[PDB]
């Protein structure tokens, strides 16, 4: 695909900072662009990570696969270290829409087997069931990258 | 003394741009956190990292060229000890050691 | 930073932000803006305790910590009519239903 | 800053900075008034459906969203008690926000 890591084989020292209240799963997109999980950061914590130039990164709630921002954006790709200075990846909550935020919370109180039993519009059962999905987000993001002329 | 100025020549060589495709894991100390290695410092009792050797060299800290060679080999040895033989960084260590051994062999005395 | 507030009288409720260093009078001057009443004819309370017109919002106990966008602090409001301030009445919001059984 | 009045089902009035209320796709339409001609602009929107306890929590969202969207400060969690969750979802759904 378009959305994959380039096998540059050129190291870059990065810092992952989890400035979210969530447990963060960093997700590496391998050379074929298939998402590979890496070890989670607890909220607040930061950690160095040895990565390489042109390696595509993405960060999700480890528990729920909610999307998170890195440097106020969707994806993270380190440049080359300028004079061996580390690249910084600041991970934060996005401003979710109130609708999505509500969905997050209700998913957290209700087993999928019981979405149907909730006293609410038939449309919302479909939204609830539409769990945060890395794969799906990749397709939306890949169409966004082809629509940049 | 004239040897430790050759020793410096060898380390210079190893840092050179041509070697970099295989030399690069060894340039700076092993960052155990960055690499996610919980056991490295337990298994490797005395690490060494080419930059530390440059450090020890410029402070005239090696009594002779034998002692310099020992750290270079230690650095590689540590790599060989920590990793399985089929590992990629082992391949790279070997190639860099090829450079070192050849130049270290041809020093005069 | 700024403090984020709900200013509440009877069944009206105003969402407005302000500075920690900004004062109570300056806050009455916002309410004037909205509801068209002079700061003279306004009293502001934290909880059930009247606020000095000169005291800063920070001094009154409104911090960035206590008065967040997502969780704004409540200022009480009273109005004079007929040459006396009314008692400070704030209508409570509706109650939510008991949590569903699937929600437990 | 202009303002708007938002009236709940139980006749609570919530006055919020106009720009904040625009956060709602639904309210953007109602205040912008009908059509191409943006004549017929009112300051007020009634909600037959949404009770005070939901609409207040909605308005808190507007504040939060405006404050924090495009912000370079650290973003906090928008909190939702279990009791509001359902109603608030329906609300959020209806308001397109």
Swiss-Prot record, chain A:
MF term (GO), any: transcription corepressor activity
GO cellular component: cilium; cytosol; endoplasmic reticulum; intracellular membraneless organelle; microtubule cytoskeleton; mitochondrion; nucleoplasm; nucleus
Outcome of swapping residue 102 to F: In VHLD; type I; No effect on interaction with HIF1A nor on HIF1A degradation
Effect of residue 128 to P: In VHLD; type I-II
Tissue: Expressed in the adult and fetal brain and kidney.
Result, substituting residue 128 to Q: In VHLD; type I
Outcome following mutation: residue 96 to C: In PCC and VHLD; type I
Associated pathway: Protein modification; protein ubiquitination
Effect the entry attributes to changing residue 89 to T: In VHLD; type II
Region Involved in binding to CCT complex: start-end pairs: 40-95
Disease with which this protein is associated in UniProt: Pheochromocytoma: A catecholamine-producing tumor of chromaffin tissue of the adrenal medulla or sympathetic paraganglia. The cardinal symptom, reflecting the increased secretion of epinephrine and norepinephrine, is hypertension, which may be persistent or intermittent.
Domain characteristics, as noted in the entry: The Elongin BC complex binding domain is also known as BC-box with the consensus [APST]-L-x(3)-C-x(3)-[AILV].
Protein name as it appears in the record: von Hippel-Lindau disease tumor suppressor
Whole-protein coverage range: 61 to 209 of 213
Swiss-Prot record, chain B:
Post-translational events: Phosphorylation by CK2 disrupt the intramolecular binding between the bromo domain 2 and the NPS region and promotes binding between the NPS and the BID regions, leading to activate the protein and promote binding to acetylated histones. In absence of phosphorylation, BRD4 does not localize to p53/TP53 target gene promoters, phosphorylation promoting recruitment to p53/TP53 target promoters.
Residue(s) at site: Acetylated histone binding: 83
Phenotype upon changing residue 80 to C: In CDLS6; likely pathogenic; reduced acetylated histone binding
Function as written in the Swiss-Prot or TrEMBL entry: Chromatin reader protein that recognizes and binds acetylated histones and plays a key role in transmission of epigenetic memory across cell divisions and transcription regulation. Remains associated with acetylated chromatin throughout the entire cell cycle and provides epigenetic memory for postmitotic G1 gene transcription by preserving acetylated chromatin status and maintaining high-order chromatin structure. During interphase, plays a key role in regulating the transcription of signal-inducible genes by associating with the P-TEFb complex and recruiting it to promoters.
Family stated for the protein in its record: Belongs to the BET family.
Protein's name in the database: Bromodomain-containing protein 4
Protein source organism: Homo sapiens
Gene: BRD4
Curated annotation (Swiss-Prot), chain C:
Pathway this chain belongs to: Protein modification; protein ubiquitination
InterPro entries to which the protein is assigned, alphabetical: ELOB, Ubiquitin-like_dom, Ubiquitin-like_domsf
Location in the cell: Nucleus
Intrachain disulfide bonds: none
GO-annotated biological processes: positive regulation of proteasomal ubiquitin-dependent protein catabolic process; protein ubiquitination; protein-containing complex assembly; target-directed miRNA degradation; transcription elongation by RNA polymerase II; transcription initiation at RNA polymerase II promoter
GO cellular component: Cul2-RING ubiquitin ligase complex; Cul5-RING ubiquitin ligase complex; cytosol; elongin complex; nucleoplasm; VCB complex
Protein origin, superkingdom: Eukaryota
Modified residues (Phosphothreonine): 84
Chain ranges of the Ubiquitin-like domain: 1-66
Function in brief: SIII, also known as elongin, is a general transcription elongation factor that increases the RNA polymerase II transcription elongation past template-encoded arresting sites. Subunit A is transcriptionally active and its transcription activity is strongly enhanced by binding to the dimeric complex of the SIII regulatory subunits B and C (elongin BC complex).
Complex and partners: Heterotrimer of an A (ELOA, ELOA2 or ELOA3P), ELOB and ELOC subunit. The elongin BC complex interacts with EPOP; leading to recruit the elongin BC complex to Polycomb group (PcG) target genes, thereby restricting excessive activity of the PRC2/EED-EZH2 complex.
Protein's UniProt name: Elongin-B
Organism expressing this protein natively: Homo sapiens (Human)
Swiss-Prot record, chain D:
Annotated function: SIII, also known as elongin, is a general transcription elongation factor that increases the RNA polymerase II transcription elongation past template-encoded arresting sites. Subunit A is transcriptionally active and its transcription activity is strongly enhanced by binding to the dimeric complex of the SIII regulatory subunits B and C (elongin BC complex). Core component of multiple cullin-RING-based ECS (ElonginB/C-CUL2/5-SOCS-box protein) E3 ubiquitin-protein ligase complexes, which mediate the ubiquitination of target proteins. By binding to BC-box motifs it seems to link target recruitment subunits, like VHL and members of the SOCS box family, to Cullin/RBX1 modules that activate E2 ubiquitination enzymes. Component the von Hippel-Lindau ubiquitination complex CBC(VHL).
Signal peptide: none
PANTHER family for the chain: ELONGIN-C (PTHR20648)
PTM text: Ubiquitinated by the DCX(AMBRA1) complex, leading to its degradation by the proteasome.
Protein name: Elongin-C
Similarity comment: Belongs to the SKP1 family.
Single GO molecular function: transcription corepressor binding
Pathway(s) per entry: Protein modification; protein ubiquitination
GO cellular component: Cul2-RING ubiquitin ligase complex; Cul5-RING ubiquitin ligase complex; cytosol; elongin complex; nucleoplasm
Organism: Homo sapiens (Human)
């Amino acid at each position: 695909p378009v959305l994959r890591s380039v096998n540059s084989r050129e190291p870059s020292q990065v810092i992952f900072c989890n400035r979210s209240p969530r447990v963060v799963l960093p997700v590496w997109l391998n050379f074929d662009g298939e998402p590979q999980p890496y070890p989670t950061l607890p909220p607040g914590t930061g950690r160095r990570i040895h990565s390489y130039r042109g390696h595509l990164w993405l960060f999700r709630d480890a528990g729920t696969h909610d999307g998170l921002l890195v440097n106020q954006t969707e994806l993270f790709v380190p440049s080359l270290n300028v004079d061996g200075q580390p690249i910084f990846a600041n991970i934060t909550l996005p401003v979710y829409t109130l609708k999505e935020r509500c969905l997050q919370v209700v998913r957290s109180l209700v087993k999928p087997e019981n979405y149907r039993r909730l006293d609410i519009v038939r449309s919302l059962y479909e939204d609830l069931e539409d769990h945060p999905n890395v794969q799906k987000d990749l397709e939306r993001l890949t169409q966004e990258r082809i629509a940049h002329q | 003394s004239e040897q430790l100025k050759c020793c410096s020549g060898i380390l210079k060589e190893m840092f050179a741009k041509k070697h970099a495709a295989y030399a690069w894991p060894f340039y700076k100390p092993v960052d155990v956190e960055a690499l996610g290695l919980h056991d490295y410092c337990d298994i490797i009792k005395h690490p060494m990292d080419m930059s530390t050797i440059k450090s020890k060299l410029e402070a005239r800290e090696y009594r002779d060229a034998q002692e310099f060679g020992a750290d270079v080999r230690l650095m590689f040895s540590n790599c060989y000890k920590y990793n399985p033989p089929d590992h990629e960084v082992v391949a790279m260590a070997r190639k860099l050691q090829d450079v070192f051994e050849m130049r270290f062999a041809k020093m005069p005395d | 930073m700024d403090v984020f507030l709900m200013i509440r009288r009877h069944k009206t409720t105003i969402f407005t932000d302000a500075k920690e260093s900004s004062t109570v009078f300056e806050l009455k001057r916002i309410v004037e803006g909205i509801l068209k009443r002079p700061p003279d004819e306004q009293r502001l309370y934290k909880d059930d305790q009247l606020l000095d017109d000169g005291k800063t919002l920070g001094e009154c106990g409104f911090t960035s910590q206590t008065a967040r966008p997502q969780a704004p602090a409540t200022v009480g409001l009273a109005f004079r009519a007929d040459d006396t301030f009314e008692a400070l009445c704030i209508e409570p919001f509706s109650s939510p239903p008991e949590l569903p059984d699937v929600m437990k | 800053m202009m303002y708007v009045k938002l009236i709940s089902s139980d006749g609570h009035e919530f006055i919020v900075k106009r720009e904040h209320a625009l956060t709602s796709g639904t309210i953007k339409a109602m205040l912008s008034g009908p059509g191409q001609f943006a004549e017929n602009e009112t300051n007020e929107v009634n909600f037959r459906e949404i009770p005070s306890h939901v609409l207040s929590k909605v308005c808190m969202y507007f504040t939060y969203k405006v404050r924090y969207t495009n912000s370079s400060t650290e973003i906090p969690e928008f909190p939702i008690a279990p009791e509001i969750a359902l109603e608030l979802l329906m609300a959020a759904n209806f308001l397109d926000c």
